[PDB]
Subunit: 368 residues, 4 copies
């Protein structure tokens, strides 16, 4: 039942992603000394100017200059011409820091969860490739293989699909668009060649690459001093690339900068968890689990499972499977998913869903 | 086939929405003197401090101080204690301004369109009520009826649904959560009373209000000097409240601050247009039109119509109806939808979809 | 030998003085926990926006938000309409803090010292009155006597003089100009009346007030919301009001924000000390002591005493008196003057010279 | 009657001087299109971040981004590593611009004027050399002779003097301290050599250089990426280097950023004018003219001439000479000195007094 789809992703150098990372880095820095630290911060950046804003109630001694500059260094901004230098950039900290199981969900909410068997990660091929494409470039950048490669990048992958008496089977990569920052001493012809052979063909399964697949490598020409400006980078502005690439559903809640007590993060992770668990347990090929919460109440206020006719069990057979295998209460979620651990910075880029190294990405058994 | 859903919206005073408005105000200010002005700007705010960033190639004389301060005044920030005063706030302008039909879509893209017959607006009841709830408060604020009401507000509406051999029929409003900024001389009991009688009951159809409907008016108690602070307002961070309240699909593209040449805005409007047109023409009760574009190419690179079995015509009968009634090429879209007109500021709040006063909200005939 | 002179001063609310105070407050906050803390910081402010910049090598735990906001509170900025509110203003801290007798003067330098017997403070009448005028207003503000009085103020005092076979004898106050911020509910007529009777006549000696003395109270009309904006306040920009009101000599070195190891502060204090000591010891009626230092060298590189023929001893009789009573080496200065003590904030306003509560203002014995 | 003196100066790259220049550049940009433009602005800078503040009532179309970036380019900040790049730095404009002979002096004031015959410029040798030293470095920088030389520099010159039955005769240059920013590929030994032979010996008269003259070239070693940072550049903070190097007297008024209607600038220029005219006319070898103004009154409120016994005419013989040759009323000053002309930027560095290319530096005839 043919149709096409496109998804995108950005590198660690993208202005918005730098803020997402810095904000989560401050979250990690607090969890390490106070696992109950209440973190609510965000970052704004603009050409060698980083602004740390936020309200965080914690009891840990943190050097914000150090956590911000270290994060910029990690990203790869050490030289001047790159558009950012952790040693010279302005780090304005306007941060306000205080000191002092059946909890109860804060703020009326509605979290979504999604999973599909088109890839081993249980994530849309389009967004998976988009992420992996950026990931590979960072590897070649940090390894030395492609030393002209710079931190800021953007990726777009559009794959042609076809339904299947249930749902969504990828057929081939229609076109790929990739833009990456770079050093001066490297020709546009050499860049485009490396992007096709060393990054694209090294991550995209042969089955999907074609003789017609369209490539748009460095479409706009040169992207040299295009360091983090992009007319002001911000936290929580890359909401769709952090989730499913526009495949599931999104209420609008941002992750980065918020601790484990905010249902926007925790519950969203929990919902992905159950979704991935369901398909992994063969109970369906594609699911859209919807979990709703009521302010004050701990136990979820109605969970809805949305298979697209890919399940044999039948919604409201699968719901009981979820109700007998999962306890989606806020407090239990953080305990079961080990959400007090400082893993948030690595979650701040290349997507929150998909990577198995995250608790919520480990499928639960599901006793049926 | 019961399930519940929740959606939210924010007032003109919300930090993020102030930026969305200011950014679009600068867009309007340019279109009025140069309908071909290339606008790409964004705003950041934080307690009497507004930062205007951006790259805009236009040929019109604009007083950015005036357009920013006027927008803050319009919103209702004239006094000190409100958290913003257009006469005293810091307006730092770091804006860069230059001077000098079958076009071709910029940037690979995938826009979504959505419509449902559950309301006359052809928008989800949950998001429509959420918006109207905030709209009414602004009216009572500007009229004088409720003089304690301040610009910043947040609304959440959760409605209980039930499918129907096709899709989505609202049954009743399960719960409503509304928070609004206010003046000191007004009791929490008087506020909650006015919110239920004068705002909620004056906008929510009797059919949906119940004896069990849950109300959470000013849950967190007071919200006096709150105003636009919420440690850092930003543009393009309220992506879901600007669209369908998490009902359709979203690729992640922001509207505010971008001119009509960006497919993220134009094509998204066009997609809503056709969706609304389809249901209005009786061709379906609920649609999710998906329009894809290829960088360089003008004609859309595959459009997909997604009815949920609510159509009698049958997808790929409806596609020809769309292909015979619509010309979704970027240039044609702006011409047909009159996208060079300065209506963007009013689009910057209370949602981009739903209100009939916008070109894309006027259903096309559809000759079938 | 008639001639006239004018001097000025500013209140604790003046933008520049707020920065001078905040910078010194950060200096005090460090000295209290580490008397060897190396402080080199400065502040910038602009309508509810304070920027703390600087490089300080110390080993003490300081809450910069607390020290900045407390200083703003002390000044009298607690309400919104005043142009500053310590509870709501933006405190952006871009501060960089590290951790780890015959010293030797840093940086080639030339410090000046001045004293005259026209007042008991050994300071020019014009600047003394200018300071005292602002001091009295702060008293009436903090006492409650004049509750309409606000933090920001400016004072100018011009006195008619006459030489005397030596130098400088004040005759009368020619004119006085005073401007002070205020609350809305207070008439211009009532303000001007209070300024003449309660502030001017309560500080200016009867001997100097005349029937012709010119008064310019609130010349520009109303100064209400004129809170700290004055188009950006800065540290070290009020160099002359911090010293002699344009009577001695000034090399251009700023005090506020610099610790006791900077000769610009210490040596300047030392020079005032000896000047005050000389006149107090009857060795002259007016002196301009000039102390020069050589980078690397501890012992001063030539000190020059400049009496205006008011001494009977004779320059190079008085020099030996200074060389036998004073050891102006940097390290000795800080030890003798107790410069590791946190008294710098109170030195940040109303003048560094004149007030007896400061070590350098206590005349040394002088054995001759 | 031996004594020594020291003075200093800074290059066009010094943070404070960049602001003084940018502020005056905005003043020039307005005078060119509206000679009656009311300018009152100031600048603040900090590592690739320039903040333009101010209130200017004018009727001219100015591109502040252009005038700020052009000024930074002129100074020599075009590359990244230099600590500033006009193409990449953040120019935040928070400027507010409106549109719409016997005047009368604004603000009680007291301006000073100074001149001495020790140099043809009628300025202290110490400050003249200090300025010329920095000037030469800029020449060699812009010519190409010393291509490692960067914009930011600081100079100090200390000369040994001796009175002369009147006053002040320079004997020799005791020591010279010069620090200048530089490129990486240049040894400390090569820099110090070039500074002595190519800059110092090329500007300092043979008569003053000795075999004992002390040189401190690049004392603190390297100064590479230093540039305009020095944690926070400001306007009006280099008050003494803009005048007489601590030789005359200074009331504290800043020049840069203020138009010709502010007596702080105009009257100060006028006072220098008469001082230079007096010594040039042989009426004295050293003068300190003191001009006082009364708010509201046009005609100066008492002018005092202070020769140090270097005149044969006798104070109050010279006063009549001044009263018969000069009309120091504010309006007349601007007319006679052509103060509506855009020459203020070149006045913003290397000193306001001394250079003959300025109106106030052209001696008036003086008919006696
Ligand atoms: N997703 C979220 N859900 C709930 N609270 C949040 C979230 N993100 C941040 N916060 C909270 O909001 C505060 C920061 O924003 P702010 O609105 O300025 O506080 P205030 O209204 O008191 O000024 C933090 O103290 C933090 O605990
Ligand atoms: N009057 C002064 N005399 C000497 N050093 C000073 C003075 N005021 C501040 N400083 C020093 O200069 C430093 C702050 O300015 P900065 O020029 O940015 O350092 P850098 O050149 O390493 O970037 C501080 O670390 C402080 O010790
Ligand atoms: C007490 O509730 C306060 C604030 C609110 N939800 C906002 O800043 O958006
Ligand atoms: C190593 O000396 C450095 C810097 C210099 N005096 C300045 O910033 O002004
Ligand atoms: K966020
Ligand atoms: K977004
Ligand atoms: K200073
Ligand atoms: K000054
Ligand atoms: Mg709540
Ligand atoms: Mg808010
Ligand atoms: Mg929201
Ligand atoms: Mg030194
Ligand atoms: Mg410097
Ligand atoms: Mg200096």
């Amino acid at each position: 039942g043919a149709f096409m789809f496109t998804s995108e992703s950005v590198g660690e150098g993208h202005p918005d992603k730098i803020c997402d990372q810095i904000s989560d880095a401050v979250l990690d820095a607090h969890l390490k000394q106070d696992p109950n630290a209440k973190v609510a911060c965000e970052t704004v950046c603009k050409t060698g100017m980083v602004l740390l804003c936020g309200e965080i109630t914690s009891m840990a001694m943190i050097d914000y200059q150090r956590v911000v500059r270290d994060t910029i260094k990690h990203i790869g901004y050490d030289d001047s011409a790159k558009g950012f230098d952790f040693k010279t950039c302005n780090v304005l900290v306007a941060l306000e820091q205080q000191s002092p199981e059946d909890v109860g969900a804060g703020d009326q909410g509605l979290m979504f969860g999604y999973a599909t068997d088109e890839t081993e990660e249980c994530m849309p091929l389009t967004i998976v490739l988009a992420h992996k494409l950026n990931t590979r470039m960072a590897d070649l950048r940090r390894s030395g293989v492609l030393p002209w490669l710079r931190p800021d990048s953007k990726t777009q992958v559009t794959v042609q699909y076809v339904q299947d008496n249930g749902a969504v089977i990828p057929v081939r990569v229609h076109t790929i668009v990739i833009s990456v920052q770079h050093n001066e001493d490297i020709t546009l012809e050499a860049m485009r060649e490396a992007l096709k052979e060393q990054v694209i063909k090294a991550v995209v399964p042969a089955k999907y690459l074609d003789e017609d697949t369209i490539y748009h490598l460095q479409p706009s020409g040169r992207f040299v001093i295009g360091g983090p400006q992009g007319d002001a980078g911000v936290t929580g502005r890359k909401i769709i690339v952090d989730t499913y690439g526009g495949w599931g559903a999104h209420g609008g809640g941002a992750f980065s900068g918020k601790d484990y007590t905010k249902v926007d993060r925790s519950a969203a992770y929990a919902a992905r968890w159950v979704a991935k668990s369901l398909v992994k347990a063969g109970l369906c090929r594609r699911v859209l689990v919807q979990v709703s919460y009521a302010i004050g109440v701990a136990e979820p206020l109605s969970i809805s499972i949305f298979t697209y006719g890919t399940s044999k069990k039948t919604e409201r057979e699968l719901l009981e499977v979820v109700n007998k295998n999962f306890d989606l209460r806020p407090g239990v979620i953080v305990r079961d998913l080990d959400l007090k651990k400082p893993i948030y910075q690595k979650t701040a880029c290349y997507g929150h869903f998909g990577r198995s190294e995250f608790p919520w990405e480990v499928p639960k058994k599901l006793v049926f």
